[PDB]
């Protein structure tokens, strides 16, 4: 039985989102990539550094926005910029949201030597795609 990146069935009381509800094999068919950069393309380089940056950024954001991110974080690498798009709950105060956004922007930018932007889309709650 495949235990990899799947949500096992339960009594039906377990809500799950689009990503959690889609399994790996559907990738590139029903769900796209959570990180969009040119490292892995044919003839390019720095795939390992792109992967390290992705992992570090994801952990950074998860720890920065505890119980606030309502969906996985979409990373885009246009030119040298970085765009982190997040779906966040409308549970934390807007002032705190803006401060965290600016702080993370500046710190990540200085850390990785490239402009960074964070774009938050707020929702009343995590978007249920089905119940399991």
């Amino acid at each position: 039985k495949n235990r990899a990146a799947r949500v096992r069935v339960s009594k039906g009381d377990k809500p799950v989102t689009y990503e959690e509800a889609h399994a790996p094999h559907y990738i590139a068919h029903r769900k796209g990539w959570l990180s969009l950069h040119t490292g892995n393309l044919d003839g390019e380089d720095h795939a390992a550094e792109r992967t390290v940056e992705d992992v570090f950024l994801r952990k950074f954001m998860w720890g920065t926005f505890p119980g606030c991110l309502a969906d996985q974080l979409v990373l885009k690498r246009r030119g040298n910029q970085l765009e982190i798009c997040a779906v966040v709950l409308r549970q934390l105060s807007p002032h705190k949201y803006y401060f965290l956004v600016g702080y993370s922007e500046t710190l990540l930018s200085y850390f990785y030597k490239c402009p960074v932007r964070l774009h938050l889309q707020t929702v009343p709650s995590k978007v249920v795609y089905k119940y399991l």
């Binding site: 934390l92 002032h95 705190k96 401060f99 702080y103």
Partner: peptide, 13 residues
């Protein structure tokens, strides 16, 4: 959020 063992009062957070 914004609370650490160093007790730093970050304005606005």
């Amino acid at each position: 959020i914004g609370e650490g063992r160093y007790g730093f009062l970050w304005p606005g957070l």
